[PDB]
Nucleic acid binder design. Structure first.
Length: 52
DNA sequence: GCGTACGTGCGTTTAAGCGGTGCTAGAGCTGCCTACGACCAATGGAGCGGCCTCGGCACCGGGATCCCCCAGCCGCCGGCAGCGCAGCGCCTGACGGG
């Protein structure tokens, strides 16, 4: 078994891994969609790349 | 102090509102289908700490702006007093009239 981060798979730098945890444990819902954190990663990307 | 335009009020007139249909599309709904997301157990590399060295900025001193300021100055004009006189009423000629 060879591992690659979801961060690589979605062409993203913010940690779709870590952002996923803060949803599960951030008490925002009982269950978080598997495609939910990735979409949240990019929308931060465009909202961090834009200011800098 | 100016001044205009908006507050009040009269005379049209028109779209608001009611009350009346009649349609149907879209919401609420149940049943059932199924995949996908939680949970579990191992796993390793990515991320975070504790070092630790270069270099960007900091800090400075100096010289280069570059605005800020104000009489100088001329220019311009307005007021100003003086000037020359146009313009009108009555004075006053021209002269038969009074």
């Amino acid at each position: 078994a060879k591992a690659k981060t979801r961060s690589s798979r979605a062409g993203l730098q913010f940690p779709v891994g870590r952002v996923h945890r803060l949803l599960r444990k951030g008490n925002y819902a009982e269950r978080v969609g598997a495609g939910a954190p990735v979409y949240l990663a990019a929308v931060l990307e465009y909202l961090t790349a834009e200011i800098l």
